[PDB]
Amino acid sequence: TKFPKFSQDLAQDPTTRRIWYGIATAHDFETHDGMTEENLYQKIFASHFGHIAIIFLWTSGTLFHVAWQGNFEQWIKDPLNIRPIAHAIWDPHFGEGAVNAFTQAGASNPVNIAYSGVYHWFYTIGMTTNQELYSGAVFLLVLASLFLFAGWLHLQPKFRPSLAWFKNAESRLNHHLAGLFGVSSLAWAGHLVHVAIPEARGQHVGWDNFLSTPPHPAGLMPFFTGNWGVYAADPDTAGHIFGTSEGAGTAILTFLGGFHPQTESLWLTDIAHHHLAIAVIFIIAGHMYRTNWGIGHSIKEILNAHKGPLTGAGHTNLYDTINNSLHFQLGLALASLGVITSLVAQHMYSLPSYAFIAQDHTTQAALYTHHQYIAGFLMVGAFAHGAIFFVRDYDPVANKDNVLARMLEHKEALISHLSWVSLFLGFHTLGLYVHNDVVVAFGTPEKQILIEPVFAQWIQATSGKALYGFDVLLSNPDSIASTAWPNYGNVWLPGWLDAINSGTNSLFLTIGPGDFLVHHAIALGLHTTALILIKGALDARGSKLMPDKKDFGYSFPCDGPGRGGTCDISAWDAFYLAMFWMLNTLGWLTFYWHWKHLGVWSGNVAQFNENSTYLMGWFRDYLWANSAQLINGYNPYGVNNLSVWAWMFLFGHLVWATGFMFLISWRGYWQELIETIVWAHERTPLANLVRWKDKPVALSIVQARLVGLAHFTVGYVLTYAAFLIASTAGKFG
Amino acid sequence: MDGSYAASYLPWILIPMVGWLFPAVTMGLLFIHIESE
């Protein structure tokens, strides 16, 4: 009656549907009552400020619990031996067995071992005492306070920006490319050369000797005179020990391009030089778009001048399409962020840049799986907001004959081709897996279809991995690429070739016939998830089953049992199905990564290389073999430290099967069941006294599709996090 | 649950409050709020 104050149509139904739909609709600011575009944008802006403060309070809490309850002082003595403590366990339910089991990593209290890798990150960026982390945590509390005050300030009518301020794409691109992506990268290169590189070489550069101690014995006058070679004078020698001065070198910017031979990570000077180059390129890229002064570009001119014969209108009227639509902007942002979160995951495991994080295996597994799951979620959200844009903000009159109109003008062709490629690739990946499985089971493993993944092996050979016998570009030192004949500027190449050809690191893993089939399974998952997502994006405006879906919106339940039956026709239901396929694909690739690295870390790579080509190899050497240490986390004899992970394993199974309840059984059964329960309550003595204000109804169709999806997701993630974190910590620390 | 770290009484008081007082108070206020008028 009062709760969903943003929508009067929800403050009228006397059911529990208004509670559920108030919680769900609360952030869809476009559908609130009394909403103009200006109030939309200002409310969005202050919501962003609140969320920035959420992020800063979260990292403040991580810092404060590493500082207060963690063994950061002890861990930076020998990071290889001591496990990093995340925070302290305090619940009154623990028996004596659990308290003695969870006392670990040199503590008195029960503690949680940190698998987020924040210890390695804080140790690499130069933080070496609990007081430094406490100062960082209080500083981030103050920064979060500042952003909360900024959000409250920009809700004040004097400081509320106009619509022309929010619709200013060129100035925002200038200040984000230059001032946010370039100045922050420059400032990080400054922290690296002033604090992280010197304290990696031994000396303390705090806030007190910050100005008194130059990073280089040469001042900034060599930087101004152009003689920049002194900053790369003597690099860190290959016998350098992190945190102390043995063969330091005193070169703040070098480009060795290999790995540190002791921390197994990249050199901090190489990181600083990288961020300096990135800052220079991003700063000059932020001077591209027109602003109050005369020079620059206007994006409308750039877009509208790209008209070809094979598209016709080209990109005409795409500036107003992107600028006026917030779901287009959110789809582009989520697509790029999902791509670069995949990129973060794929590069932080093969090119680690933190001290001793390539030798702590559980945190590397947790970080990879975490960022690949975030990347899958963000990519699915990009396509979800593509569908929401096509429903809500898409104008087929202004977007006449441009690239968007021609996306929708042939959607059947590309949906049918995604159908063909996903069917083709799925038929033959399952065919090869079932063939290998059947002929291995029939006692004849020599009959397997084992395909050498020659293309990726050739890619590795082009990057310098000389194991496979190709001598093409960098594996052939006589070639034009390896010598770089005009200048011989390959300063990175000796270090890179020394790092790619060592069998220890995860940089360019050896790829065999078991990797071919899982890459094609991953391609199948990507293609089928993309098929469902674009089949919801392009059919959001209507198919022949329902030529008007733009008027029912994004997430209507169905269209009745007529027209044959119309159960999951909304674009939201294509989100739903592609959410399942995303979870499957990320399960496939994280299963593959996990088993490949359990082979690599243990040294017994033969297990993956012969047993990953058929499905019971995946089932008995990975799922069954590696859960042995998991389910024995608590047995009738006792309890060890992998007991909360066994409990989370079972917990995730339970959440998953409850998701099955919501996805399989549908609303009619539950509505008549609740009708019987309502009769029971209204007709019993002593409980007639208590009456509902909101009449109990079953969850809606789309609501319980969402709830089953949430259960499937949460149980799926909790089960796999428990398994992946207890299987590595079962056998690696 | 002994506490070796500094201010071990602080989790002793903050686990009941975040476990009970924050949920009981928050659900009580939200129950008054969503059902008001």
């Binding site: 609140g50 403040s60 609990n130 509390l141 409250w152 809700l155 | 602080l10």
Partner: peptide, 30 residues
């Protein structure tokens, strides 16, 4: 290690994001 009063100092400092978050959320509710 870390001090007893640094934790309480962090708590009374974080009382300021509490107040500002309460006032920002209240102002968003309008």
């Amino acid at each position: 290690a870390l001090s007893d009063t640094q934790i309480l100092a962090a708590l009374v400092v974080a009382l300021l994001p509490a107040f500002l978050a309460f006032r920002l959320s209240t102002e968003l509710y309008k």
